[PDB]
């Protein structure tokens, strides 16, 4: 049941050529968007989330 990062918790950065720089393992956050006022930038000196190279027709 290895794969340290997916065993949820420790951090795991991704770099890419066509896709985007990701920093994303586990800690809370998700249950703070509910009891709210968990702001966020809207692309302050940034990049972009959700990322691209998926679609359809």
């Amino acid at each position: 049941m290895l794969s340290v990062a997916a065993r949820s918790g420790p951090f795991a950065p991704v770099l890419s050529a066509t896709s985007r720089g990701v920093a994303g393992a586990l800690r809370p956050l998700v249950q703070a968007a509910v009891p709210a006022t968990s702001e966020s930038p809207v692309l302050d000196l940034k990049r972009s989330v959700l990322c691209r190279e998926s679609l359809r027709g």
Partner: protein, 446 residues
């Protein structure tokens, strides 16, 4: 070893079956021990009035907070205890509620979905707690420059139509929507012929059918008749909304022409052309050497922080264009280059780049359809918009047929000398005047 072409044929045909209701039940069986079940509904915000707006977004909040058979928090307790995940979304045109769970748990997952989608307990105390929650979310969404600009772009492009509305509604509606309002919207839209039970993974289609008859029998049968309207077309306008705010540090701009709707065959050629232009972000490796000229010129000259092309689809219309984020002194250069690429493609698109576009598109299609969740979603959405499930082999055929001539003909039709809808937010003093953006939509060379 199998070829790419051959592999497309190996994908199991999505099985479609109809209930005596109008409830379509569709599935794509794989071999996975996990699955995803859900209900896709032809309900959004393009269906709402004005006083009413925010109705479904409001229902989404109440949806998982109690049913009549499962009160206050009992549902959560069931989903969580089997290790499942329950989620939901809503756009201007679609609402979805889906469970991501273990394959054995399929009986329970459908049973819960049914209970949520029909026997919902919009209890007064809860609907009252949700108004504070939603208003907070509106306050949150305001900080996301990107979400704001796409709401602005919709609001200007679709001016007096229901499509100009945001999903969440105006604050005045959030604080005034009644239980009666919600119950009525539910009655009007959450009915069988407008919903599709979708699933993907280790399930046999008969299981899904049995479950659909077992737990969804009791909708549209003794229902329908008078009070079921269709969707009226939405006039695209073509204008500009500029929200000047020098306090924010980067400008956000979103520009688009009117695209055709979901149904139109030419969404494929548009997606190829969009792919050629692609996307960029300051964390991409490869700056100067990127194929897309916009991306390349943007990276070397540092004309932006990010940009993305898009092709948003609605009933018989859509927004086709791009969005970018940049420093106050780079909005003009950024627009020039963006527009320069659209015209180039409209007139002088070459063959090699079209193959790249087609290739980027074949990868996107397949890379996206990876996992029970995106496929389940794909089945549900397709049936609502296409009436069919379009197999990968067909999408391939449609992609394969695109050559340069098609790109310059299809881009011309939508872009060449057309009025864009422009939305700007942030430090936009240098956002070019509308006439100039309009004059960049055609070329005097040509």
């Amino acid at each position: 070893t199998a070829t790419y072409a051959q592999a497309l044929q190996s994908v199991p045909e999505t099985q479609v079956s109809q209930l005596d209701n109008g409830l379509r039940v569709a599935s794509e069986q794989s071999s996975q021990p996990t699955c995803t079940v859900g209900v896709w509904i032809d309900a959004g915000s393009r269906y709402e009035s004005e006083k009413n707006n925010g109705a479904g977004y409001f229902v989404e909040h109440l949806a998982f907070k109690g049913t009549k058979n499962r009160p206050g928090n009992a549902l959560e307790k069931e989903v969580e205890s089997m290790g499942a995940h329950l989620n939901a979304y809503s756009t201007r045109e679609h609402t979805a509620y889906y469970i991501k769970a273990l394959s054995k748990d399929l009986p329970k997952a459908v049973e819960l979905l049914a209970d949520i989608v029909q026997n919902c307990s919009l209890e007064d105390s809860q609907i009252e707690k949700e108004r504070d929650v939603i208003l907070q979310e509106l306050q949150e969404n305001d900080t996301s420059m990107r979400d704001v600009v796409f709401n602005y772009l919709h609001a200007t492009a679709f001016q007096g139509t229901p499509l100009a509305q945001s999903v969440e509604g105006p604050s005045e509606n959030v604080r005034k929507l009644s239980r009666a309002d919600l119950t009525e919207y539910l009655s009007r839209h959450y009915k069988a012929p407008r919903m599709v039970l979708a699933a993907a993974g280790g399930l046999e289609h008969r299981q899904l059918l049995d479950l659909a008859q077992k737990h969804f029998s009791g909708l549209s049968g003794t229902y329908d008749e008078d009070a079921v309207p269709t969707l009226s077309p939405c006039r695209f306008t073509g204008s500009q909304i500029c929200h000047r705010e020098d306090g924010l540090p980067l400008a956000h701009v979103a520009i688009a022409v009117e695209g055709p709707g979901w149904a139109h065959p030419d969404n494929v050629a548009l997606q190829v052309a969009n792919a050629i232009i692609g996307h960029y972000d300051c964390t991409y490796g490869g700056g100067a050497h990127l194929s897309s000229p916009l991306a390349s010129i943007a990276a070397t000259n540092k004309l932006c922080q990010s940009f993305q092309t898009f092709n948003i689809c609605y009933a018989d219309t859509g927004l086709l264009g791009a969005h970018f984020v940049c420093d106050h002194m780079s909005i003009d250069d950024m627009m020039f280059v963006l527009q320069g690429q659209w015209m180039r493609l409209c007139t002088s698109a070459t063959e090699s780049e079209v193959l790249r576009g087609k290739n980027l598109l074949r990868n996107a299609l397949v890379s996206h359809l990876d996992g029970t969740t995106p496929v389940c979603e794909d089945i549900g959405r397709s049936l609502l918009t296409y009436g069919r499930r379009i197999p990968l082999a067909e999408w391939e055929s449609r992609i394969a047929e695109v050559d340069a001539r098609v790109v310059r003909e299809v881009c011309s039709k939508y872009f060449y000398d057309q009025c864009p809808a422009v939305a700007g937010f942030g430090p936009i003093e240098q956002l070019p005047d509308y006439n100039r953006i309009r004059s960049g939509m055609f070329w005097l060379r040509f």
